[PDB]
Amino acid sequence: ILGGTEAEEGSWPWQVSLRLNNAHHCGGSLINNMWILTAAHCFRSNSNPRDWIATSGISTTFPKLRMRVRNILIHNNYKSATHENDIALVRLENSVTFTKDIHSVCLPAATQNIPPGSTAYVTGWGAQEYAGHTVPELRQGQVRIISNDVCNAPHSYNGAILSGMLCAGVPQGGVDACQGDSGGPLVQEDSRRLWFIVGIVSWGDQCGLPDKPGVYTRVTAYLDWIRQQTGIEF
Amino acid sequence: ECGAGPDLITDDDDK
Ligand SMILES: [Mg+2]
């Protein structure tokens, strides 16, 4: 995360680190006690569940809980070159016992109100500058949703933002997801203070450039896929 | 069952 702050322990109870061969690789979000929602890109080199561990806690150096992974599911139409359908599910070996500090985020309704300009939080252990090192403690950034149409301006992504994607950033630039944040959540809460995952960190042109907002998988576009793969509604 | 989160708000109206 560029332009963010360190998150407090317990702030983001759904956030997990997905570790490949004992190093942080991707973020993800608990969507129930046995399933994590993340990005397909996370698994481009390794989709062996036995080589992945999910952790909870704000530190990837000293995690609070380590969780074995049973299966990794990638969207069947993930296309890496265009980033289309960048979404994946991780099934845990054991059901997590939920607490205040570890529990699930809600899935959005198909009609979830996600207006252009609306503020949202993005979280992860990614770099603070493009292609830089990961950070050991979870960071958070507050961004605004940027409509696909605006995101597709000629000086921005010029048509590369597709309907199952969404964009987010801030008016001045400098707040964004970055390398190592892939798979982590973009979240908004409703009037009852229930938090929903509206986006999954996916890609962007470098990080934090004002004309190049971060690009996310649009969760509403995949609700049927998630329900089919897991049974979960929402 | 899902969605309990932090003492933070995403207000859209601040300038
Ligand atoms: Mg809000």
Author numbering:
A (entry chain B): 187 to 420
B (entry chain A): 172 to 186
Copy out sentences from the published article reporting this entry, exactly as the authors wrote them.
We show these proteases spontaneously and efficiently cleave their own zymogen activation motifs, activating their broader protease activity on cellular substrates. The TMPRSS11D substrate-binding cleft consists of pockets of amino acids surrounding the Ser-His-Asp catalytic triad.
These data suggest that the dasTMPRSS11D protein underwent proteolytic cleavage to release its SEA domain, consistent with observations in HEK293 cells overexpressing full-length TMPRSS11D, where the serine protease domain was detected in conditioned media and the N-terminus containing its SEA domain remained attached to the cell surface. The dasTMPRSS11D crystallization trials were initially performed in the presence of high concentrations of nafamostat or 6-amidino-2-naphthol. Protein crystals formed in the presence of each ligand, but the final crystal structures contained no electron density matching the ligands. Interestingly, both the eTMPRSS11D S368A zymogen activation motif (yellow) and dasTMPRSS11D zymogen activation motif (magenta) adopted an α-helical structure oriented perpendicular to the face of the SP domain, whereas all other TTSP zymogen motifs were β-strand structures wrapped around the SP domain and/or the electronic density was poorly resolved around this region. The TMPRSS11D SEA domain was not resolved in either TMPRSS11D crystal structure. To facilitate the analysis of soluble forms of these TTSPs, we replaced their zymogen activation motifs with DDDDK; this delayed their zymogen activation and enabled protein overexpression, biochemical assays, and protein crystallization.
